[PDB]
Design a binder for this molecule. Structure first.
Ligand SMILES: *[C@@H]1O[C@H](CO)[C@@H](O)[C@H](O)[C@H]1NC(C)=O
Ligand SMILES: [Zn+2]
Length: 404
């Protein structure tokens, strides 16, 4: 199993293409084996990059020699990983003895799938677990469908999490959401009213082989586990794979790359499964992608500075979704289009969704901003979930009121 003893996350200030390109170059060709955690944007944002202990010295020396300034934001990755393991280990002991599912914890894919089966069993008239496809390693892809329509197809909102496996707060936020809907139906007047007019489809783990791989082999793994047929390298970036300016900017055609788009659009059977479900249904109004980290809330476009026709509307909804999310804890989110807020990125879920006639396409990037990154402590799940929920309810109330 992957160990990260002495590994450090370094945060680097970057001002122009001189600094951006040399840093981009240095480990897009894998001298030093650096895994970028927060991707190079432009002038603005800070870059986060995981630096293996073996390679601490060369990289820091090189940063000095290239006039790049850095802080060490995580001094020992493995320490954080240890904490997480124990917290998980412990919770599973309690749950096995409890028969409970503790939502304030991180879970195996089996516990997620099971709890989804339990949410449907408990509320048979509202929720059912629908199998939409198969993962590359041939696991079910399980969604929860929420509906008061009694079989009939209604206008619909898609909510998926965990397309990038290491972004554990998304999956955990998603399974908390499923339980939130069923417990707050016939009680909270807004979700009750949402479900009267629309269906909600929830996919907690959009990338299940990667999620299992992160819990058993490599916690920092982000891609699918597809076997790239002219290479020994594994997996594609699920979120670079969609049929939306595929193989454009922000993607690589190198199978070994973390941003590898795949051999063709929707090649990743996990993506195809969702692309197929949605287009078969034909009546999706909302599509919300849940990621981590950076505390962002974004809308199309991402592959171009093209600028979406409904940018104005999407901006206002996102602004109010963020404002309402903040209400809970004081959590501050940036809002804006993808290509500017992060960096030009092709073939993303939300761009495909918008280009396919789903107006309200939104990327959430959840907690945090870099203190723990992907390794967000378990004790922050319920706060992230509870606050994000108000962000989600807002979007879905705009969808309800603006049916087209
Ligand atoms: C990509 O989307 C376009 C527009 O709907 C479609 O014509 C094309 O067949 C798609 N490409 C693939 C290979 O799925
Ligand atoms: Zn992600």
């Amino acid at each position: 199993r992957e160990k990260f003893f002495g590994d450090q996350v370094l945060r680097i200030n970057v001002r122009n293409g001189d600094e951006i390109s040399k840093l981009s170059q240095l480990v897009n060709s894998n001298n030093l084996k650096l895994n970028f955690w927060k991707s190079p944007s432009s002038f603005n944002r800070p870059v986060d990059v995981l630096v293996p202990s073996v390679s601490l010295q060369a990289f820091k020396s090189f940063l000095r020699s290239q006039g790049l300034e850095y802080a060490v934001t995580i001094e020992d990755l493995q320490a954080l990983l240890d904490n997480e393991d124990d917290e998980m280990q412990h919770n599973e002991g309690q749950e096995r003895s409890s028969n409970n599912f503790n939502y304030g914890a991180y879970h195996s894919l089996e516990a997620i799938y099971h709890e989804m089966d339990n949410i449907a069993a408990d509320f048979p008239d509202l929720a059912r677990r629908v199998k939409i496809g198969h993962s590359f390693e041939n696991r079910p892809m399980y969604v929860l469908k929420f509906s008061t329509g009694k079989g009939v197809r209604r206008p619909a909102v898609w909510l998926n999490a965990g397309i990038h496996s290491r972004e554990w707060i998304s999956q955990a936020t998603a399974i908390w959401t499923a339980r939130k809907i069923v417990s707050d139906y016939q009680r909270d007047p807004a979700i009750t009213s949402i479900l009267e007019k629309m269906d909600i489809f929830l996919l907690p783990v959009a990338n299940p082989d990667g999620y299992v791989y992160t819990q058993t082999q490599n916690r920092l793994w982000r891609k699918t586990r597809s076997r790239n047929p002219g290479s020994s390298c594994i997996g594609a970036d699920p979120n670079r794979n969609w049929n939306a300016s595929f193989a454009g900017k922000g993607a690589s055609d190198n199978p070994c790359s973390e941003v590898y788009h795949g051999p063709h659009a929707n090649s990743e059977v996990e993506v195809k499964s969702v692309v197929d479900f949605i287009q078969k249904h034909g009546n999706f109004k909302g599509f919300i992608d849940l990621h981590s980290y950076s505390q962002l809330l974004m809308y199309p476009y991402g592959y171009s500075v093209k600028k979406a026709p409904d940018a104005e509307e999407l901006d206002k909804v996102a602004r109010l979704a963020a404002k309402a999310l903040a209400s809970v804890s004081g959590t501050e989110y940036q809002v804006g289009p993808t290509c500017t807020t992060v960096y030009p990125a092709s073939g993303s879920s939300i761009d495909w969704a918008y280009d396919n006639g789903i107006k309200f396409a939104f990327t959430f990037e959840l907690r945090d901003t870099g203190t723990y990154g992907f390794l967000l402590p378990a004790n922050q799940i319920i706060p992230t979930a509870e606050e994000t929920w108000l962000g989600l309810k807002t979007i879905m109330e705009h969808v309800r009121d603006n049916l087209y």
